[PDB]
Design a protein around this nucleic acid. Structure first.
Length: 86
DNA sequence: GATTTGTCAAGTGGC
DNA sequence: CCACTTGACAAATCG
């Protein structure tokens, strides 16, 4: 309940894999849209589509009154996720 | 100064 | 409706 990565586990593996692969989170190294789709098996574009849904859908999920201020290039990948959600 | 990267509007098409 | 591609496009990117 102390970081974003925890709430990443509320989506299908695709919106999880696409997010983690793209933001350098959870062991993966931050990757281009193309390299993520080549490793999943989808087009460069659909990966952004999977990204935005899971990103937009992560905003809905975060409306559980999480005391938004908690622990929010010097930007560690977790902090690159939040400002991508909202 | 071109290649790469993200993005758009419109496209196929239904293990 | 859905997952997904196609083919354009400006802009970030890199040297």
């Amino acid at each position: 309940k102390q970081s974003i990565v925890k709430w990443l586990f509320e989506l299908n593996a695709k919106q999880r894999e696409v997010l983690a692969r793209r933001f350098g989170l959870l062991g993966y190294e931050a990757a281009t849209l193309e390299d993520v789709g080549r490793e999943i098996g989808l087009t460069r574009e659909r990966v952004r589509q999977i990204q935005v849904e899971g990103l937009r859908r992560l905003r809905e999920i975060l409306q559980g009154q999480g005391l938004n201020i908690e622990a929010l290039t010097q930007l560690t990948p977790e902090e690159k996720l939040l400002r991508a959600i909202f």
